[PDB]
Amino acid sequence: NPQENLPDFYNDWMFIAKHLPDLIESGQLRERVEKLNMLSIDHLTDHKSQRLARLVLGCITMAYVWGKGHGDVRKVLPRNIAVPYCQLSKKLELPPILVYADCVLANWKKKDPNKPLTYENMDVLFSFRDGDCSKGFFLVSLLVEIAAASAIKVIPTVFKAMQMQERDTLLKALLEIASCLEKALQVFHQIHDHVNPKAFFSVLRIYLSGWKGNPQLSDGLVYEGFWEDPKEFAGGSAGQSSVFQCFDVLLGIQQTAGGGHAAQFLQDMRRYMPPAHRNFLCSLESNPSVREFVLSKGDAGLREAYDACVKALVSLRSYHLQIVTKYILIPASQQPKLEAKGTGGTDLMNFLKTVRSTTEKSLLK
Amino acid sequence: PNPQENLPDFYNDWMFIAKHLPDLIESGQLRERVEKLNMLSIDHLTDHKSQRLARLVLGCITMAYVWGKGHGDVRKVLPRNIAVPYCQLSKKLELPPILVYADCVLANWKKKDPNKPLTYENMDVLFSFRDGDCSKGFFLVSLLVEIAAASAIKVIPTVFKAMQMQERDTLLKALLEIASCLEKALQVFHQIHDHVNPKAFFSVLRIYLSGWKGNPQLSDGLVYEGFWEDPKEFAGGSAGQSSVFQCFDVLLGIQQTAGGGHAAQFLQDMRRYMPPAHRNFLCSLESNPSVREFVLSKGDAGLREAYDACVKALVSLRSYHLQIVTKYILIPASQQPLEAKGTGGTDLMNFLKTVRSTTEKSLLKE
Ligand code: HEM
Ligand code: HEM
Ligand SMILES: N[C@@H](Cc1c[nH]c2ccccc12)C(=O)O
Numbered sequence: 001n002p003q004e005n006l007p008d009f010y011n012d013w014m015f016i017a018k019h020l021p022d023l024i025e026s027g028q029l030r031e032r033v034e035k036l037n038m039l040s041i042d043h044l045t046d047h048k049s050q051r052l053a054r055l056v057l058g059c060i061t062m063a064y065v066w067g068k069g070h071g072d073v074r075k076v077l078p079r080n081i082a083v084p085y086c087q088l089s090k091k092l093e094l095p096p097i098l099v100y101a102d103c104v105l106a107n108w109k110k111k112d113p114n115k116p117l118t119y120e121n122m123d124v125l126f127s128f129r130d131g132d133c134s135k136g137f138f139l140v141s142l143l144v145e146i147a148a149a150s151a152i153k154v155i156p157t158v159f160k161a162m163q164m165q166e167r168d169t170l171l172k173a174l175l176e177i178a179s180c181l182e183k184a185l186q187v188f189h190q191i192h193d194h195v196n197p198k199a200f201f202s203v204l205r206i207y208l209s210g211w212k213g214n215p216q217l218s219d220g221l222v223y224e225g226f227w228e229d230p231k232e233f234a235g236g237s238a239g240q241s242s243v244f245q246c247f248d249v250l251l252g253i254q255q256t257a258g259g260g261h262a263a264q265f266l267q268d269m270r271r272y273m274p275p276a277h278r279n280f281l282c283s284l285e286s287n288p289s290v291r292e293f294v295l296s297k298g299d300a301g302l303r304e305a306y307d308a309c310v311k312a313l314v315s316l317r318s319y320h321l322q323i324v325t326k327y328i329l330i331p332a333s334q335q336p337k338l339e340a341k342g343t344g345g346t347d348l349m350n351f352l353k354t355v356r357s358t359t360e361k362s363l364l365k
Numbered sequence: 366p367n368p369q370e371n372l373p374d375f376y377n378d379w380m381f382i383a384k385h386l387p388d389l390i391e392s393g394q395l396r397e398r399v400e401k402l403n404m405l406s407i408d409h410l411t412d413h414k415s416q417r418l419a420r421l422v423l424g425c426i427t428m429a430y431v432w433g434k435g436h437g438d439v440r441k442v443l444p445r446n447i448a449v450p451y452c453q454l455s456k457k458l459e460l461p462p463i464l465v466y467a468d469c470v471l472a473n474w475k476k477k478d479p480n481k482p483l484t485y486e487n488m489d490v491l492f493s494f495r496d497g498d499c500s501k502g503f504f505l506v507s508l509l510v511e512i513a514a515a516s517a518i519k520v521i522p523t524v525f526k527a528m529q530m531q532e533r534d535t536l537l538k539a540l541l542e543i544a545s546c547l548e549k550a551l552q553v554f555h556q557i558h559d560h561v562n563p564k565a566f567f568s569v570l571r572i573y574l575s576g577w578k579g580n581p582q583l584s585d586g587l588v589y590e591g592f593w594e595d596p597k598e599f600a601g602g603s604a605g606q607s608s609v610f611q612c613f614d615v616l617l618g619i620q621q622t623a624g625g626g627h628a629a630q631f632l633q634d635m636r637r638y639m640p641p642a643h644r645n646f647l648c649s650l651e652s653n654p655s656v657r658e659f660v661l662s663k664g665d666a667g668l669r670e671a672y673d674a675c676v677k678a679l680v681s682l683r684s685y686h687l688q689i690v691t692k693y694i695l696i697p698a699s700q701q702p703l704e705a706k707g708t709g710g711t712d713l714m715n716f717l718k719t720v721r722s723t724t725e726k727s728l729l730k731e
């Protein structure tokens with residue numbers, strides 16, 4: 001449950017970021033950033049505050065770099081921000097750029113402190129532009145994660161059942177896992193009610209983009225006073241969610257095998273997540289293979305239960321491709337004047353088709 | 366335990382080509398024997414040991430086929446009757462279908478006298494590429510440095526146990542034991558000068574360890590005919606693919622894989638060029654609380670010095686390693702008519718010095 005306020009010492013940062021949709025319209029955001037002082041991170045108390053502080057320097061860096069978002073960029077980040085950001089990013093073992101765990105996972109609050117985590121009772125902590133649909137987009141993302149995260153607590157039952165040779169317990173656990181992925185798909189449906197296609201594509205989207213393989217910062221960002229040469233880091237995406245990567249690992253879909261670009265991207269995004277998230281994926285891989293266990297057992301009900309989890313991942317990814325049609329492909333086709341790139345930096349159609357197809361190949365006959 | 370030395374009779378056609386690479390390459394007839402092979406199922410490799418020896422046999426054959434005599438006439442297509450079982454076997458072991466450190470060092474040896482110790486003069490390799498290539502001395506000394514470094518692996522649990530039990534004295538003795546294993550390993554590394562000739566290594570053996578990822582001679586990769594339709598790119602071998610040698614940076618909190626740079630990228634990438642148990646061990650080491658944070662918070666000069674003996678021994682290993690690079694690459698490269706590439710594909714001088722300096726910066730200044 002994420003902190004909403006930093007100490008008053010950091011009040012200078014909190015103001016630029018909570019009043020970001022208007023500093024940006026008024027073309028005075030670059031100056032107020034450039035008119036800041038290098039406030040040291042020593043006055044950051046617990047983890048909560050440090051996560052919040054990262055989300056604050058993240059939205060500010062993205063605001064500074066992309067500005068109005070229609071071409072006028074800044075290839076150099078002032079030391080007033082770059083140094084504290086980079087110091088706090090090294091402490092959290094993260095790159096100095098906004099990542100999924102910042103802008104989705106630390107970026108919310110509930111209205112009634114003891115009423116359920118539903119879209120009506122929740123709100124985001126930070127926006128970029130008026131009408132960007134950032135609340136609908138960040139919160140539906142968070143809601144889908146939460147729904148799929150329900151299966152995390154059954155994963156230990158899966159491995160215990162295997163090591164103890166508990167066939168009925170294994171089968172019920174896999175069906176429960178498939179059940180949660182189906183619910184996460186239903187939650188996904190709500191994105192249509194809260195995110196507008198044109199607003200997402202032309203307003204919000206560029207604030208999530210990064211400087212890794214981006215022609216508009218073909219050398220990356222230079223973090224003044226921390227590194228002399230510029231560095232490249234990828235923009236955000238849910239490819240940076242350990243929850244969504246974890247189902248492939250759990251089921252023995254080897255998304256990170258083979259040496260290709262999609263495999264390379266998914267492995268790379270694991271050091272764009274908090275170390276505990278990356279460690280969870282590690283620990284999952286270190287266990288015996290759920291897939292290899294089910295394959296060897298000559299058991300139709302167990303095979304069918306395993307297949308239910310893979311079908312549900314295919315359903316998610318195909319629905320997600322239709323989300324892509326409506327929120328990227330069509331809006332891109334509807335604007336004044338060569339391969340469509342994701343905020344994470346990928347050749348998005350080939351990447352997404354490769355990942356779905358790899359899922360598909362895991363379906364057991 | 367000991368690597369398997371023979372495959373089932375079913376795979377005799379493989380074993381024959383892998384055991385006779387010096388003469389088959391020299392005589393100009395290795396590729397024709399490979400191209401005339403039959404496709405053999407991998408379904409007769411029953412246990413893990415046979416699969417490991419099979420990967421080594423197939424890996425050496427693949428390098429000999431692609432590189433040939435090692436002076437330019439390369440092959441960009443790997444014939445299906447090798448490609449297909451090689452790719453299937455590789456998939457089962459979660460390894461790329463190219464020769465890696467775990468094949469040509471960790472599985473490429475046997476002892477002469479069973480009840481005698483693992484020392485250079487009681488050991489031998491299973492496969493070589495070319496007459497006069499120093500592969501025997503090169504692979505065995507590499508293994509010997511690994512075995513000496515690996516004696517530290519069994520004290521690693523004591524380290525994390527000592528931390529959580531607040532067992533200060535036990536921690537210190539464990540860290541000193543580790544620094545001692547790493548100094549042992551630096552001593553065994555001296556054996557390389559006695560069994561590897563620099564000219565043979567550089568101009569004869571090195572080309573057989575090189576791969577097809579960012580490599581001029583095979584700019585799109587290699588086609589594994591009959592198994593994937595498009596060429597695939599894989600890096601060549603190096604001890605960057607040893608979990609033993611990466612694990613000390615992890616245990617000591619030296620963040621060699623942080624920062625997004627090339628060296629970090631290479632060292633993380635090599636973790637899927639090592640068997641899964643090896644990879645799991647690295648990231649499990651990364652799951653544990655930081656030894657470095659523990660020592661730094663304790664105000665204990667003895668603790669800090671035991672940690673620093675470890676960092677310093679790593680620095681000595683890598684500085685000596687830079688001299689071996691001068692003797693076996695830079696001098697032989699100058700000695701015959703952009704930036705020198707290692708068999709692993711790195712810009713090796715920037716890369717090795719970046720990794721050395723990241724070690725140096727971990728020394729306790731307090
Ligand atoms: C407007 C809505 C969305 C758009 C346009 C979109 C687009 C994309 C793009 C372009 C990529 C490729 C990576 C890159 O270069 O950025 C990607 C990957 C990914 N996205 Fe989305 N996304 C949206 C919402 C979501 C949501 C709500 C989820 C939550 C389940 C999600 C889950 C994923 C995952 C897990 C990946 C990695 C690929 C995979 O595992 O299939 N996305 N997405
Ligand atoms: C003739 C002998 C050797 C030469 C010429 C050599 C050269 C190189 C090169 C060029 C690299 C860069 C990666 C690449 O692109 O290949 C490298 C990395 C590395 N080498 Fe060697 N190497 C030799 C023997 C050894 C041995 C015996 C060890 C045993 C400890 C070792 C340990 C390492 C390690 C651990 C790395 C990864 C970088 C690091 O962690 O410092 N090397 N070496
Ligand atoms: N990757 C998406 C943007 C995106 C969607 N969900 C995200 C969550 C976090 C960061 C970025 C995103 C795109 O290219 O359009």
Ligand SMILES: N[C@@H](Cc1c[nH]c2ccccc12)C(=O)O
Nearest residue numbers: 466571574602603604707708709
């Ligand atoms: N990387 C070394 C070759 C090498 C040394 N030790 C190895 C162990 C395994 C594979 C290759 C190697 C080079 O560029 O010359």
Ligand SMILES: OCCc1c[nH]c2ccccc12
Nearest residue numbers: 148184244247313316317320
């Ligand atoms: O690209 C499809 C999005 C996706 C992949 N894996 C998931 C797991 C749970 C919820 C969504 C996804």
Ligand SMILES: [C-]#N
Nearest residue numbers: 236237238239
């Ligand atoms: C989706 N990113």
Ligand SMILES: [C-]#N
Nearest residue numbers: 602603604605
């Ligand atoms: C050393 N490779």
